[PDB]
Every structure is written in C-alpha cells, then in structure tokens.
Amino acid sequence: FNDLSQLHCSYESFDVESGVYSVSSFEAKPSGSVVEQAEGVECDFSPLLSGTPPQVYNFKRLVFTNCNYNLTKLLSLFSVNDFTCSQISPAAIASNCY
Amino acid sequence: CPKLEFANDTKIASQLGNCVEYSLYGVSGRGVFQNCTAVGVRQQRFVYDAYQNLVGYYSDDGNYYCLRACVSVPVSVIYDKETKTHATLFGSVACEHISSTMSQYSRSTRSMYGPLQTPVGCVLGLVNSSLFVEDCKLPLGQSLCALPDTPGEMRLASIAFNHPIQVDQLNSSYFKLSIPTNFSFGVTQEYIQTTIQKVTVDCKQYVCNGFQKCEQLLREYGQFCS
C-alpha cells in the first residue's frame, strides 16, 4: 500500500524499531523510444521460393546481413505443418533484430 | 530488422538528454543520450566498457552520442516508534523531482511546500529549523537529524559539536589552568559475551528423522555426520 507496509512486512511484525531504513527505490518512466541506424534493401527470399529444394544432406544456405525482413511476406504463403523453436521463442524471429 | 513506420520523433537529436527506451536495431535497453566527442572507430558503431555495458553510439548523421543510463533516485524512510511519525528522503539529489513520474506500488504523505534541500538530498515530510541536538537518536546522515514531536512532522536539526571548555594560552611564565570543582560517581555498564551457548546436533536424527530408506540414502555420504 505504501512505504510503511513494505517496512512492516520486512520484519513480519506490527512493531518495529525507530531507525533510518533503506527501502526499495523507484524508477523514472521512459520519455519515448528511438530506433535509428543504417538501413538498406529488403532481404531477398526469391531463390528459396524458386527451383527444386535440395535434399537434407545438401541443404542450401542463405545469409542475411543489413536488410529488412518481414515474416508476413513469406510465412503467410508457407503451409507450415510443424513449427518448433529451440532456445528461442517462436515469436522472437518476427520482431527481434540480429 | 523488420519494417517499421519511422516517425519523426525517433532521431537522437529530437530526444537528447531524456530517458528513452532505445532499440538500436537489436541492441535493446533504456538510457540517456548525451553529446560527446568522437571516441573509438566509426566502422564498428558500438563501444563497451570493461563490464560489457554500452557506452556510446555513432549516429547516421555523423554525430557521436554517449548512451549512459536511465538513472533512478534512491529513497529512504525515517520512522519513529511510539510516535507515529515518518518522512521520506531522496538521496544525493537536488529538489527537482515531484510526484509525477512514479513507479513501484504507491507512496503516501500527510496533509500540507513539502521538499527540503539537504546535503543528503531532497527530503519530503520534514520542517527545517535552527536547532542543535547533541544526543540525536535518529541520525539521518552527514550531520542531519529528525526530532519527533511529543505531534506534527519531525523538526530537522543539525548534529552539533560539543565544543570542549576552552582555556586560553598565555605566552608568559604564568599559566591558565582548568580545574573541576564538583564531581559525581557515574556507573558505566559493560557486557562481554564470554561464551556462546553450548549446542550439539544429532546428525542422523535431525537430517533423517528415523526412517529406514532415509538412512540407506544417507549412508552413502557417511563421514559428513562425523
């Protein structure tokens, strides 16, 4: 409820001792958000969607650095039977940057 | 990165000197930007200290901005028993912060200025006065003290210095001496913890409580009880 409530539950008693007591500090609210660094062309997923997909022992690798990727452009056309993500959340790939 | 509508209020120069939640294209946090001189290399665009904390960022306009911290203000409380009197303190900060930008649960005061500037910071709930106390029991810090009323808010006093009885020095053959004329017998009570209470513990009884399967699972450890 207030400071003194936290002070009382810090001792598990309704009677405390007179004294200066350190208590949990407070945080200043953010004033806004900034998102700004160098950007370029969107990431290209065309050769992934074109041609015969190769075998599992001959998997084709695509690297992406300094580009813009939107999962709504390619995962929407993906008839995803199974979606798993290990040591990462499935929704992290849609928003987080690397 | 994903595509995002970049509004005009996203540049660093728009929000200089303000605690903002920065997302530098994958580098997330909250902090304060500031203007500094060019330090480091331009190509890497990210600098860290010895403790892996981001220090600065080279903006796309060619300006270097130090990203330091969204620094908070500590709070302490002075409370007295048998007189329901309490006040709050913000440590080592000028009296600038008011009740607007809040976090945690809540806070409360009494009926109504309210701040007070002290060498320890900014104080809410105290009235200042030119009082001197040699036997302060609520030592606030530096040399400030709170005096509960015996019932308004506590008076703010300075912890005074008991000046010893001054005696003059004569630069001649004579001397000015100080001598007591009256005396008392004072009792001083002292305690010495000469020995703690002798206690022992039964290892298998305490840890096992007399169960057979417990005992079998305890016997692999063995000499720990010994």
Place this chain on the structure above:
Amino acid sequence: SIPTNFSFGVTQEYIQTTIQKVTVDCKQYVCNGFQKCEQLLREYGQFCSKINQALHGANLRQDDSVRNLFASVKSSQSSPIIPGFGGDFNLTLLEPVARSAIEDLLFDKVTIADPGYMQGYDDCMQQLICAQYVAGYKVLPPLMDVNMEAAYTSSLLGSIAGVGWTAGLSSFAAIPFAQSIFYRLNGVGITQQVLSENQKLIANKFNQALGAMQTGFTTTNEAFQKVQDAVNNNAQALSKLASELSNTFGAISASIGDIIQRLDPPEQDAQIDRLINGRLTTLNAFVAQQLVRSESAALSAQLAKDKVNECVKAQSKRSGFCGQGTH
C-alpha cells in the same frame, strides 16, 4: 652501552576504523524492475528481508562503533588553534586551515572518488562512480560531515599538549607545545641539563623530522600503502556488485528483458530461476564478507580507541606499542 646522538623518527600507522557503509536494494538489484521477474522472485520472499536485516545490522554496528570512538576521543577540555602554534616547533602541517594541510595532502595523494552526495544523480545525468546508482544499490553517507570530523581532530591537537602532563583526565593543563616536548623528553630518560642548553638543535631536528615525511607520501610509505589497500578493498567490494550483474551463471543472456523477450515461458522460467539463484548466492556471499569486514572494523576501532587513549593523550611507556624506539 650508551647512545651519544639521536634523531626524531616519524612512524606512520593506519587503522581501518570502519568500512564504507553500503546497502543494496534487493528487488532492484536482482530483478531490475520487471513484472514476471517480480512474480518469480516473490516465492523466495524473506531472502531480501534477510539480507536487508543483515546489512542494516552491520551498518548500525559500525555506526555505534563510530559514535563510541568519537565519544572516547571527545576531549573534555581543549585549547584554541592559532597561527604560530607551538612557537619555534613548526607544526603548521597539522594546523587546520575545515581540514588541515596534512589531511588535504593525504586526501589529494590518495585516489579518492567523491560519491556524488550533492549532484550524483545529475552526475549520472549530464556529465566509475556513476555505476553505484544504475546497478541497484547505494552508499550511505557517513555519520559525521567532513567538517565535523575535523573539529574533533582540532580538539585533539589542542588537547595533546595539555593532557600529557599529569595522570588523571579531570584537569586540563594546556601548556604551549615546546614545554610539553621538553617535559616529555625529561620523562623519557634525558637529563634537564642537555634540554636546557640544546633547545635549538633539537628544535631543528624536530622540524626536519616533521618536514621529511611531507614529501615522503608515496609508495615507499607503509601506512600510505595500507590506506591505498583499504581504499582498493572498498573499491573491489563495490566493483563486485557493479560487475557480476553481467555474469549469467549458466543463462543464455544477462538481461531479464531480453530473456523474457526471446524465450518461451517454460524455458524463460528456468533461465530467470538460474539468474535469481546466482544473484542471490552472490549477494549472500557479499553479506558474509561485509559481516566479516564489519567485525574486523569493530576490532580495529577498539584498537584505535585503545591507542588514542594510551599513547596520544599521554606518553605510553610500553616498548613499541605504537612507536618504534622510545615513543
């Protein structure tokens, strides 16, 4: 065997009378203000209360020790300090002109950072000591202001010339410093004839001995090294809490927000539990170290009170208790 020539030697000693008073905000340090973090922290509960109680007890013990020793060194009666104190005996290094010259020289030559007691929030706002706010703890202000500590030393400097003349603390006999030195030199086993005929050379020797250590404040002084070691000990103790926040203790990240942003709740629960366990173990180790250092500080404060009560207000005859050779 008898000596024929003599010198005044300065021996510099340091006593760590109290460590720096520090406290930590448990939920702020371990949790950094995240809601799911707070919910995963509330099951532990009284651990924050336990460490807060231990740190507050240690701080109150150090505060009581400081108050007790300052009541012990509180002289009953002192003398004013004027320019030209001690006459021919040059002691103006100890003259307060606020602090004194020797104290200001000692504070200047030791690497000391002011912990932002006026505008430390502004120090982190506009322009290593900035980390004591962002990392989620604080350093308590000392019980005395600098200004008052000083008086206390001014009173002690005014009273040393007077108390050390006759046994018994009841009276005060604040003789000028030169005759106090003459009486002490008579008392340590030197005849009054050589004191009566050779005041100038012993005055020059005392002045040279006092002036020698003014430029000696360097690595070669053992007490200066001990002061630097104590300051570095405090710096390392605070640098722990400022440093192993970045330690992960097996987690894949050192940020709670990045963990809850990147991980599924079954696995972010385990990651946050590992982070909480590591931070709490580190905090308990720091609490134990603080208790050990506080007990050592209390014992050293008792030793300092004994030394200032024996061989400061009086001339102790103990062989090298606080001064090598005849003190």
Place this chain on the structure above:
Amino acid sequence: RLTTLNAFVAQQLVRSESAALSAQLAKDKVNECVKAQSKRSGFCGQGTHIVSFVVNAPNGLYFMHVGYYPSNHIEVVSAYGLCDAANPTNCIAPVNGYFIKTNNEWSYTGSSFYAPEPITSLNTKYVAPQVTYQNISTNLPP
C-alpha cells in the same frame, strides 16, 4: 539439510572464535581494572576509573564500573613550581597536583578537585631549576 548444517557449523565456529577472543578480553579486564585500579584512560571506565564489580549474565559476564565524573570547571592561575630568589638552585615541583595562586600567595590543589590548601613537604618534590619557574621573595613556602 546438510548444506544448512554446514553453514550452521561455520557460524558456530565463527561465534566460538569471537567468544574466545571476548573471553580473553574479559580476563584481561578483570585482571587489570577489577582486582586493581587501572590508570589507563578509559580502558574500562569513562573518566577516571575508580572501582569495578563483576556479576554473571545468562550468556556472558556483566561489568559495572564506578568512575569519576567532573563538573563545574573553573579557570585559575597556575605555575610550574616555586624557587628561592636568594637560592635559585633549590626548586620544588608539585606531586600529583598543581601549584595554584589562591588568596585568603601560592597554594596546592589536587588533580581532580579544586581543594586549595597550604603547601607543605608531603606533596612536593625537589627538581632542577629552569628558566620558566616562579621565584618568590616575600612568603617562602616551608
């Protein structure tokens, strides 16, 4: 449970070492300023220590020290000792006190009480003459 017991054992060892050190301190105090009157300034009694009493306490040892406490100080004129004007070689000095100028002349007083009383031979010692002493030629002390 074993980790808790090991922590308790470590705490017990620390407290036992502290108890041994405090017991040595108590033995020192009861050997110095209980069976005798210690002249150490505030070793076990604030002010001039007079006497001490030792009783038991449910965990330790309780001391009560009766000590001297001054009050109502006064400022007087004092010297270092009396010498003869005709015989500057002979000089006397106060023993456990001071030479105080008090009228109805010079007088002696104690080191802890303002007690003027006429100067005699049972409270002074002979000493070599110096320049700073206070010679006298109208009322020679005995």
Place this chain on the structure above:
Amino acid sequence: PIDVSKADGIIYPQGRTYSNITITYQGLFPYQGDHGDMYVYSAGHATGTTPQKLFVANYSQDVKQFANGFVVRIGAAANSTGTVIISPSTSATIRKIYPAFMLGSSVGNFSDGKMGRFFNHTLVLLPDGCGTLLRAFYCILEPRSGNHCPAGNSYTSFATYHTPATDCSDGNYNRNASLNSFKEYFNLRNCTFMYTYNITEDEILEWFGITQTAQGVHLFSSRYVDLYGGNMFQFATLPVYDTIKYYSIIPHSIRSIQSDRKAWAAFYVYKLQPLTFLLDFSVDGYIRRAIDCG
C-alpha cells in the same frame, strides 16, 4: 617473427570495439615469435627484351592444412634495396607484391604424380591490374592437356606470369592479364561468383587475415581502415558452402626484361589457433599494445 607487443597480426573484435581499456579476449590468434612460412616471388628469364621461360619456386607442390585461418604480412621488405632472386649479383628497389591463394578440401596428384591437384570447388584469390584488383572466386577448375599443362605432357608446375611492359602502364592494366595468365593454365567451370576489390597502389606495408566460420570465409584487412596503422578489419564475407581444410600458394613469375629486372617483396604466413590475449584499446580504439597468455 611477429611481435605481439608491437601489435602485428591481431584479429580485431568483429563488431564491438572498445576504448582506453585493457581487456582479455578469447579468440583466434597467432603465437608470439613465429618464423612462419615466408615465401618470395621472382621474375622469369629474359635476354635483352625477350621474355623467356619462367623462373618460379616449388610451392605448387606444397600444401598445408587451413586449420583456423592465418594471417599474412604484405610488403614488409618494400621501400628498400635488396637482391634479385634470379640475379643474385643484381640489387634493385624492393617492390611490394600481393600473393595468390588456393584453398580447398581435397588433395591429389597431377598427371605426372606431383602433389597439388585440388578436386571439386576451389577458392582462388588472385590480384590483377598490377595488384589494383583483388579478384576472388570459389569455382570449378579444370586442367589443360597441352604442352607444359597439368593434364598434358612436359608438365612440371603451374604459375601465373606478369609482364609489366604492358600491364603496369598508365591506366590500361592490359585488361586483367593475370586472370588471363591463370586461365592460360586452367579452365573455369560452374563458377559461383566473381568478387572484385579495389586497392590503390602504394609503398606502405599492410596486413591481411583469413578465417572461416559457419557464416562463411571472413577476410580481414588494414587497407580499408588503418592505412598508417595496421589491424584486422572486416571487409569480405565470402558465402562458402563447405569447410576449407587445406591451402596452398600459386607460384608467380614476372616477365620483366633483363636490363630492367626489379626486385619483388617477400611475404609471410602465420597460422592462427585459439588463445586468450590481453589487448590495450587506446583512445581511438586501435590496437597498439597486446600481450599473450602462453
């Protein structure tokens, strides 16, 4: 030998620079004081103004494991007077040269049984236009069956020839005639790419480093950033498909005339293995002081 205290051949942190701090970094690094794999290039035979038969070393038959990448110091002997390799009695100005690199994962014998054949896709680094261009390709190579050709008769070794009478003129560059000289011996099939890089010609010593990760083959240099200094800095991320196991150096000869035989510099090779270095990042963040742990 490389002096780590003199800050030679240290790989910079890849994306997180620092300033004015001493920090311990764990990564891929060389040992202090390695003699390395110093190699030298020489000009071919010439009588008057007739460019005669080549004059190369035996490095075509030498192969070493790629391991964790390696660093190469370029032009450490230039801006000085040194002897000519083909003519020991002749002393000329030492000029910097840039080397040719051959990397792969299969090792085999030629038609005459000599070591040096690399099967399947092979990474080739080759300078051209008197070293102004830095062509690179991980492509398929095919031997030729002609005279003095790898699959043909009278075969001894393979090399790349340079003729600065027409290559090193003003402008010109004889349209990438070092690529012509390489294709005079080999054929290019199913080529994956063709990366070109520009470096201005000068007489300043420089550094280069090559390594591989799961992302690909990373090429580091000081020409992009630290011209007057020298440190690794990321310029190339080759998207390789397979792990590189072995590497080798292409021999190179110069078809200079005998009356104008000019001295060429010798380069060095130092292998990289994982260590933990201690680095002093200065106010500019450049590495100038570094010490080892082993």
